[PDB]
Design an enzyme around this catalytic site. Structure first.
Site, short mmCIF file in Angstrom:
data_model
loop_
_atom_site.label_atom_id
_atom_site.label_comp_id
_atom_site.label_asym_id
_atom_site.label_seq_id
_atom_site.Cartn_x
_atom_site.Cartn_y
_atom_site.Cartn_z
N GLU A 146 0.81 -1.25 0.00
CA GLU A 146 0.00 0.00 0.00
C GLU A 146 0.82 1.26 0.00
OE1 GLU A 146 -3.01 -0.45 3.13
OE2 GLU A 146 -3.71 -2.31 2.21
N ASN A 187 2.36 -4.80 -3.41
CA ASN A 187 0.95 -5.16 -3.25
C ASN A 187 0.08 -3.91 -3.00
OD1 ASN A 187 -0.96 -7.40 -2.83
ND2 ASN A 187 -1.00 -6.78 -0.62
N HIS A 223 -9.86 -6.25 -3.15
CA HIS A 223 -11.00 -6.09 -2.21
C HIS A 223 -12.06 -5.41 -3.08
CE1 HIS A 223 -9.00 -7.42 1.35
NE2 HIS A 223 -7.98 -6.61 1.12
N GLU A 251 -5.75 -10.69 -1.89
CA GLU A 251 -6.64 -10.51 -0.68
C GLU A 251 -8.08 -10.46 -1.13
OE1 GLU A 251 -5.39 -7.28 1.90
OE2 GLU A 251 -3.26 -7.65 1.52
N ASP A 253 -11.84 -10.56 -1.71
CA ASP A 253 -13.16 -10.70 -1.00
C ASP A 253 -14.07 -9.71 -1.68
OD1 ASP A 253 -12.35 -8.25 0.21
OD2 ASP A 253 -12.02 -9.17 2.14
#
Length: 324
Positions: A146, A187, A223, A251, A253
């Site tokens: 990030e 990432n 995400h 990650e 979802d």
């Protein structure tokens, strides 16, 4: 209790890429149904928290690898590969990194924070190499996490404030020197929307790779939401992969925006089916897809939600059957 006889999720993608999941070290015992789901459906694991900076070096020189090693041992026992998450972040990072130790009211210098970053990265990679050797399941690490802000500029975290923009290059140099066998990833989230942040990730990696920085891949957190646009995700994957780097979905979802109704579950199933058809269509670039949590009851998202393929009772959801 889980459904023991339905298809093992990762086997559906055996000719494409590993399917992983992020786990908590306290949910790996045999009697825990979350552990049973983990072993059945996934062939790759990631520590949801136990390998973050605060979880490995809470105070200077005091390294805490027990929880990370419990996950590694489980991965080895279940013949799972792992991703290492993460060597650098602006969250879940202890304050001591950024303080002058003789005057904690003042910031550490660029050279002291770079030395602390080098020691942290080198100790972490050397721990798994020396303790596990050839059995180390970790295939790669999120070296930085990030580092872009919402507008695509570099995030002004304490790392940027103290060191300057080359902290990113230095983190990859230190990780590559510590273990050259590791695949090294940058990432981030919101880089699947084909907006200014996607463009800024492409520009940053193009610049650093052209400068010889050993970045092997880009991790797209993914995400996503029930309202995400598949066309934007496809364009983002292709743009980022044009740099000649691996793409991993790290990650995954799906944020339901508070609507967990049966109709929304059906909409989620259609979108997840489209998302996995896209991932299969991009198999020449994608080398792993990892879900951020084993089941909805242990998702990091606040309630109400239903973000994953297994519901709060650990049963397969419409999205699971849509994909398999």
């Amino acid at each position: 209790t889980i459904q023991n006889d339905i298809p093992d999720l990762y086997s559906v993608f055996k000719d494409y890429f590993p399917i992983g999941v992020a786990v908590d070290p306290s949910r790996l015992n045999d009697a825990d149904p979350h552990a049973q789901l983990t072993a059945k459906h996934f062939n790759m694991l990631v520590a949801e928290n136990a390998m973050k900076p605060e979880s490995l070096q809470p105070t200077e020189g005091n390294f805490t690898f027990d929880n990370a090693d419990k996950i590694v041992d489980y991965a080895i026992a279940h013949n799972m590969k792992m991703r290492g998450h993460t060597l650098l972040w602006h969250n879940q990072v202890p304050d001591w990194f950024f303080q002058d130790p003789s005057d904690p009211s003042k910031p550490a210098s660029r050279d002291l924070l770079l030395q602390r970053l080098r020691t942290h990265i080198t100790t972490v990679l050397d721990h798994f190499k020396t303790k596990y050797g050839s059995q180390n399941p970790i295939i790669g690490w999120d070296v930085v996490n990030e580092v872009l802000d919402d507008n695509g500029n570099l995030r002004n975290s304490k790392w940027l404030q103290i060191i300057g923009p080359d902290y990113i290059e230095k983190a990859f140099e230190y990780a590559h020197e510590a273990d050259p066998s590791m695949k090294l990833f940058i990432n981030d989230y919101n880089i699947e929307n084909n907006g200014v942040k996607t463009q800024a990730m492409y520009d940053l990696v193009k610049k650093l790779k052209n400068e010889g920085v050993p970045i092997n891949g880009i991790g797209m957190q993914m995400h996503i939401s029930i309202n995400s646009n598949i066309d934007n995700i496809k364009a983002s994957i292709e743009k980022l992969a044009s740099l000649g780097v691996e793409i991993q979905v790290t990650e995954l979802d799906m944020n339901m925006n508070g609507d967990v109704s049966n109709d929304a579950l059906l909409k989620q199933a259609r979108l997840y089916k489209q998302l996995f058809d896209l991932f299969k269509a991009e198999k020449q670039y994608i080398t792993a897809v990892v879900f951020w949590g084993v089941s909805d009851d242990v998702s990091w998202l606040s309630k109400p939600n239903a973000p994953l393929l297994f519901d709060s009772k650990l049963q397969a959801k419409p999205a699971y059957w849509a994909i398999v």
